[PDB]
Design an enzyme around this catalytic site. Sequence first.
Site, PDB file in Angstrom:
ATOM      1  N   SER B 145      37.045  40.128  50.344  1.00  0.00           N
ATOM      2  CA  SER B 145      35.789  39.489  49.988  1.00  0.00           C
ATOM      3  C   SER B 145      34.626  40.171  50.689  1.00  0.00           C
ATOM      4  O   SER B 145      34.465  41.374  50.576  1.00  0.00           O
ATOM      5  CB  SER B 145      35.813  38.010  50.370  1.00  0.00           C
ATOM      6  N   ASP B 253      37.093  38.333  39.268  1.00  0.00           N
ATOM      7  CA  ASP B 253      37.012  37.780  40.610  1.00  0.00           C
ATOM      8  C   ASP B 253      36.239  36.475  40.551  1.00  0.00           C
ATOM      9  O   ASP B 253      35.170  36.417  39.949  1.00  0.00           O
ATOM     10  CB  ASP B 253      36.342  38.771  41.563  1.00  0.00           C
ATOM     11  N   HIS B 302      41.065  35.684  43.606  1.00  0.00           N
ATOM     12  CA  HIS B 302      40.178  36.051  44.709  1.00  0.00           C
ATOM     13  C   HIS B 302      40.993  36.479  45.922  1.00  0.00           C
ATOM     14  O   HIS B 302      41.801  35.690  46.419  1.00  0.00           O
ATOM     15  CB  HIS B 302      39.289  34.854  45.088  1.00  0.00           C
TER      16      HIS B 302
END
EC number: 3.1.1.98
Lengths: 347, 351
Positions: B145, B253, B302
């Site tokens: 991330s 995502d 994710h």
Amino acid sequence: NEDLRLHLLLNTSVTCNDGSPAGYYLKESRGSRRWLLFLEGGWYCFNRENCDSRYDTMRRLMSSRDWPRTRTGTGILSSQPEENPYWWNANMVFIPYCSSDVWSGASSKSEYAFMGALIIQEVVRELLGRGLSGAKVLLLAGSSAGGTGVLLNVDRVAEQLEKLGYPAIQVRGLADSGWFLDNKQYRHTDCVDTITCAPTEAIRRGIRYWNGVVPERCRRQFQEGEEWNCFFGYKVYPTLRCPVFVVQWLFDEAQLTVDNVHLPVQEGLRLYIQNLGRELRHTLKDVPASFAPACLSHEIIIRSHWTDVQVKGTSLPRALHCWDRSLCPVHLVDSCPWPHCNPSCPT
Amino acid sequence: NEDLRLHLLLNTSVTCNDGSPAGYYLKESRGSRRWLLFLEGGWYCFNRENCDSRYDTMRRLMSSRDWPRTRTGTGILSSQPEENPYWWNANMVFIPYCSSDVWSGASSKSNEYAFMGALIIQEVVRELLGRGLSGAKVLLLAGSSAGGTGVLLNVDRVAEQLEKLGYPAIQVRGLADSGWFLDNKQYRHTDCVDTITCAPTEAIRRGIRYWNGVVPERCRRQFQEGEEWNCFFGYKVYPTLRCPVFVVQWLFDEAQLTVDNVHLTGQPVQEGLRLYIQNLGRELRHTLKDVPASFAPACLSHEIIIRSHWTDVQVKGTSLPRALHCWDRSLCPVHLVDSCPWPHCNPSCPT
Ligand SMILES: *[C@@H]1O[C@H](CO)[C@@H](O)[C@H](O)[C@H]1NC(C)=O
Ligand SMILES: [Cl-]
Ligand SMILES: [Cl-]
Ligand SMILES: [Cl-]
Ligand SMILES: [Cl-]
């Protein structure tokens, strides 16, 4: 900085339930000689299925794996003068409850390990090298299972200290919501859950399951195999050597829970809750140092709003300070037979 | 047992948002010359108002106060051969994300929050040198991330740091997971209020100024002064990277979808939305065309590289662990991008 900092025990054989290291949080106050040692509560488990259930849902209470490296002291552990008017400047110790044994377990080998009593001993040992050896007063405090942990351990700690050669330290206990009755349930039920099981039967099983020790002074007052009696305040208390201040809601939620009361009001139930409070008042009749308000609640001494509760125009911190002085009023029990009849009661 | 042990930074003037000391977890593997340094993600905050609500709601990400003393390595950080078949034996470092600045804050000065992400990395690396890193062959800077984007912003800075410190023999590499974003038009417009739904270009424009953020010099010299936000976007910063960087990126995502104000609650899916999601897969695949080392499944998800089930996803018969091993060899397919631009076209997608 005011945060209590985590120390995990150096000695390897003393562990939480899952074998992870036990520990304690400490904030030193390098001018003070007052020591506040707090034992966390949170039930217990007395067989494998119950313990495995507690592991899946309440792992914090069985493992150190995810313990934060610091903790903010609250209520009696707070360093804020306004939250803790009398004791804010004390050395603050918080001992996390990761043994599920009401701090009774005393065997150093192990499945699930049960080492509550040894964790305390071992915390005390380390603290000596961190100022405890200079203490004037060591107050062993605790909430719920921790509160019962106090009655179980306070004299053992006093004797550990004197055997270690520090006899000047004055050892006292503060038991908060760990004063229960081994009474008849409201409506009967079998011993299945942690939540519902009869006070008597829970401890009977637990003690066998944990290899639990009870204080030597109470132990000898009962036959071998009846050690369970000593988990109940009104039985262990008369035997105590150290002074112990008792804080107990007259209608403790945990008491009611094990008594099988679930909460509209049945008329038979009104007469039982009435009776319970009366019996508790009775057991506290000869308890000089006590603070028992007539509320439906659970735990108080590390809650921030522990200052707001009053019995007979006296607050809890005041009562405790009067008690410390005595060693202003000290025996504060409500003569008030109904929940919420004190206006001070928490919301 | 094989747990990573916490070390708080010795230099206490390098800190998390709230003033608490930053730090890192470490598992030493003294027989191994490989190092994996993982950068944690979890968004950011780009003004005082949402930094305050983030402090109320997500204090863990702005402080070291609640960090445990030890951590179990998972996925690429795991010491379990079966969980991590190629790298289980490496030296393992987890660097928690407490700066909310996508690892770009380079300013020590700062009653305000402190933003020191790039300085945290710098300090972790220099401390590590005295704990074995000086004798390393390979330092893989990995991240998920915001940590994934943090890899892109920091990998060359780390390489420069080591050469300057006189350790040229350490090969620095990057692994960016779920940090490869499009600076695109939202599906449905919103005002930039909540962090998670502020359009990506705008969030970064505000962020850089609020954090006093730094971007890589080689990317920086390619854009007007004041337009440094460009360098937070993978496809814009990647071409000028010196270090080799492997890119792991779900085609769909959830963070990209969130900043695009797309919400996949279920029920029927409108045609406008369908069209938008299709284009998103396409643009993402396109940006990855000249990235030789990439792994991009057509899933809605994710992060992955420290997830336990990171061994399960496959692209064209090849797993991510294998894809990475192959990349290690290259320095055995390495360019693995799904061609069907719908979430779940790939059967091995996480559930
Ligand atoms: C932190 O401290 C070390 C050693 O005292 C120093 O060399 C280093 O540059 C410092 N880092 C920062 C960002 O000030
Ligand atoms: Cl220390
Ligand atoms: Cl509270
Ligand atoms: Cl007084
Ligand atoms: Cl060390």
